[PDB]
Design a binder for this molecule. Sequence first.
Ligand SMILES: O=C(O)[C@H]1NC[C@@H]2NCC[C@@]21CCC[B-](O)(O)O
Ligand SMILES: O=C(O)[C@H]1NC[C@@H]2NCC[C@@]21CCC[B-](O)(O)O
Ligand SMILES: O=C(O)[C@H]1NC[C@@H]2NCC[C@@]21CCC[B-](O)(O)O
Ligand SMILES: [Mn+2]
Ligand SMILES: [Mn+2]
Ligand SMILES: [Mn+2]
Ligand SMILES: [Mn+2]
Ligand SMILES: [Mn+2]
Ligand SMILES: [Mn+2]
Lengths: 317, 317, 317
Amino acid sequence: AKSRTIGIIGAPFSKGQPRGGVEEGPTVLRKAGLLEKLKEQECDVKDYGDLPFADIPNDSPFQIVKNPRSVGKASEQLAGKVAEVKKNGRISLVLGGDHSLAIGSISGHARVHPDLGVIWVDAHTDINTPLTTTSGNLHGQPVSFLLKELKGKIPDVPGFSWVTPCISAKDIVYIGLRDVDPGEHYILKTLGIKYFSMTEVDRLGIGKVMEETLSYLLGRKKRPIHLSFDVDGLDPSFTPATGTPVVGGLTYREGLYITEEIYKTGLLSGLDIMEVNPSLGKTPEEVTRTVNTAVAITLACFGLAREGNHKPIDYLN
Amino acid sequence: AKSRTIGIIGAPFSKGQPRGGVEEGPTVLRKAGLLEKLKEQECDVKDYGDLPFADIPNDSPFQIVKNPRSVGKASEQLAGKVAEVKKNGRISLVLGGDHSLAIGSISGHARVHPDLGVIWVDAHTDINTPLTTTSGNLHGQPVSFLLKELKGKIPDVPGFSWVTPCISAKDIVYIGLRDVDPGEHYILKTLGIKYFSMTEVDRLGIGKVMEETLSYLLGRKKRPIHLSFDVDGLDPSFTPATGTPVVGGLTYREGLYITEEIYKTGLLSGLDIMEVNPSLGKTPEEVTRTVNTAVAITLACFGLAREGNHKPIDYLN
Amino acid sequence: AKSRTIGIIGAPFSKGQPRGGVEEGPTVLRKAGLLEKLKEQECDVKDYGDLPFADIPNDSPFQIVKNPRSVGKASEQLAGKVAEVKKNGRISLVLGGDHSLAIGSISGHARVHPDLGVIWVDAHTDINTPLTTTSGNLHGQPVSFLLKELKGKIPDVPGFSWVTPCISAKDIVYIGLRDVDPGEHYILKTLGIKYFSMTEVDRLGIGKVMEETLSYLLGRKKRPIHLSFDVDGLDPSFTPATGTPVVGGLTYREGLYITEEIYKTGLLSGLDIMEVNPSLGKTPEEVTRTVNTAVAITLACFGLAREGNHKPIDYLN
Ligand SMILES: O=C(O)[C@H]1NC[C@@H]2NCC[C@@]21CCC[B-](O)(O)O
Ligand SMILES: O=C(O)[C@H]1NC[C@@H]2NCC[C@@]21CCC[B-](O)(O)O
Ligand SMILES: O=C(O)[C@H]1NC[C@@H]2NCC[C@@]21CCC[B-](O)(O)O
Ligand SMILES: [Mn+2]
Ligand SMILES: [Mn+2]
Ligand SMILES: [Mn+2]
Ligand SMILES: [Mn+2]
Ligand SMILES: [Mn+2]
Ligand SMILES: [Mn+2]
């Protein structure tokens, strides 16, 4: 089935942020037996491997923005590969790696599917511009590089001249926000982006959050969905091995429900499993928990249901 | 009062599953002060003691089905004891023991009240037949032996000739589901059994889940309610000392809300507190925590409300 | 802005209960940088200091009621300081200290704002009278001294001759109740007090609770709100360093949702942060977890929003 025909892309990249180890995210997710569990779930899995991100020495900052050429090239490479995987009729599954890679993941997906709608699962908006950012970390900036409305607000940053904004403010829904910088809150509110902070999740429950999310994106007509999942969108009690954890996150149950509802639409075309840093758990158990949750999240994206699952055969015969 | 009149049955049995210690559940629950706690709560409590489950050595498997004669005989003796407790005008409170004892508990209860409805609180459906089972552990099959619609699909298993299916597929509601086998999922779907998996709980909220459950079982006519509570129904952060734990469970609050709602009907007639295994904690606190949660669930079944309770007297005098 | 204009009152008092350390509550909340954090989110902050509570030797009990003169004088002192702050056109922020100080806090507030409405966030009703109490601890009795409808039910207790009942049973809403004594539950029913115990929060969701809480108090017209927040209203997994902890409490999210909703009305006029006891942590991390949670709740009462916050300028310039 289309909703179970997958292409795996490893993105061992970390230079989009300061904490080392997120480049081991595809490695630890593969070792956890992701490809195997997907095949046991009636999925047609093709592995495209891990992208070779060659080192860029003398990659001086653009103002305060660190490693621009490295980030820009990594996303340039991932775009080409996501566009490749999408042309072959497969759902692209990107194993991160820091959230800056979403520039390439969405741009590559948009090349083949321009009418795509984004669902962004994160504690963060990641919408800072190279001028609004105070950190200079490009994993907190991918959405600003992708929005057509922020054209003219993004300066010519080294390594990003290949970029062409591919999504409008209207094409994205955020779920799980709880750590939004003031510039980002200004962008979020002035551009009129649809969002569900933890406040909206609390008020409505995840049930109506999904009803409202999917209706907003798929009301007009059926269109491709790109889910960019940052594991820090979930509470640190489920994904502690992450770069920027924030308390009061989405439960494991909510995370499963979101991915379960997206599967049921049959419109998943792109998936990002981002910010798994296996060198950041306090105990070895913390690392396995994060990886186990990220694996559980991905399987739900491709059919695994909590009510059970069966093949089209009579089990009583 | 009828909703607070109780007959306690200790069912120290473990041969429905592979892990030793579930037979100590009735000891630990008593040791925790369950009898004293119910009497503080204005309950009329009679202790019927623990059932002697005399050794049945030479009980070789029926196909892949382990200990069939021991499991069947225990459920047959339990049925007889539940029927006697029911004849004494008391609510049978069976302290398990593995969940295979539900064959006996429900058969013996349906003997006195054939019009009963079942609420099954568990992470699992326990609806595998001796032919769909992969484990061959009978605690994962009790419901198949009880359903009228499965008559013809149950082989002639030694120790089970006394069993006549006593409930229709329409007289059962599952709450808590998150680990369902393929064969079980086929049965659940084709028989049209009402269930609220962790997906429905997430979607609706425990509030609507309880409203639908009580309307579905009592809307047509008021009838006795048999609640079969498997402690693995709750999240392993509340009930860790159990045989088959599954993440993303029902919360402590959700557990108490289910039971407070059942108490308020005044129609609870049978209760099963199953799968407590005091040998299965990672620490001695994990054990006390499971017993404490189980005790708390039991108290809510017999009137203990979080808003408070008071006797019919003038407290300001 | 009125909603962000604060008068800080430290109340290091513990004699309303038998556990040492609750007097260090103002100290640890200040140490964690509360004032600095409020100033950072555009609040006008005046520090009225930590009140000096003179020792009362020969403070003989009233029947079973412990330290009546000490608790009575501490509240009488706090009433004077709260009324002074209210007369300055500032919202009073009381850093406790046990909950018996709510006698002084609400009394002092009602002196300047007789039309006030109270939101009581607790695991407890704290409505026992000096005659219904079984512990004799005054922190479990403040509401009884404040309620107009309990005039004639409260005897002449030394230290409380200055008290005038200032709120009607119709002017208070409880949130989070799960440990209510018989006498308290009886007072709740005979006086027709509006409450949302954990049972109602479970049935309705924190969204409906807040819609209903605000419309019950403000339906007729706008009126000042006094939020009395006991940290034990929240689950011991978020606030463990407290004297009387009860399992199955409000989540970290629910706590913020309540306080974010109260900020939005712009009617917050009085606030108490009660029962933080830093000497009741099992580990130093338990203490920092209670304090950080208590700070998070306080900041949400004065504008900090999970969706984000921005100054009234152009960030894209
Ligand atoms: O621009 C920034 O660096 C910051 N702005 C809000 C967040 N707060 C901490 C870091 C952060 C980015 C999260 C990036 B992440 O991939 O983890 O979602
Ligand atoms: O038939 C089986 O063995 C399995 N079918 C689903 C469950 N998954 C693990 C074991 C299991 C039984 C749970 C039994 B219990 O009492 O814990 O619900
Ligand atoms: O009057 C009493 O002592 C008791 N009545 C119900 C409660 N349960 C134990 C203590 C308690 C009051 C908590 C006071 B507190 O401030 O923590 O809410
Ligand atoms: Mn992100
Ligand atoms: Mn993030
Ligand atoms: Mn079971
Ligand atoms: Mn189970
Ligand atoms: Mn209190
Ligand atoms: Mn309290």
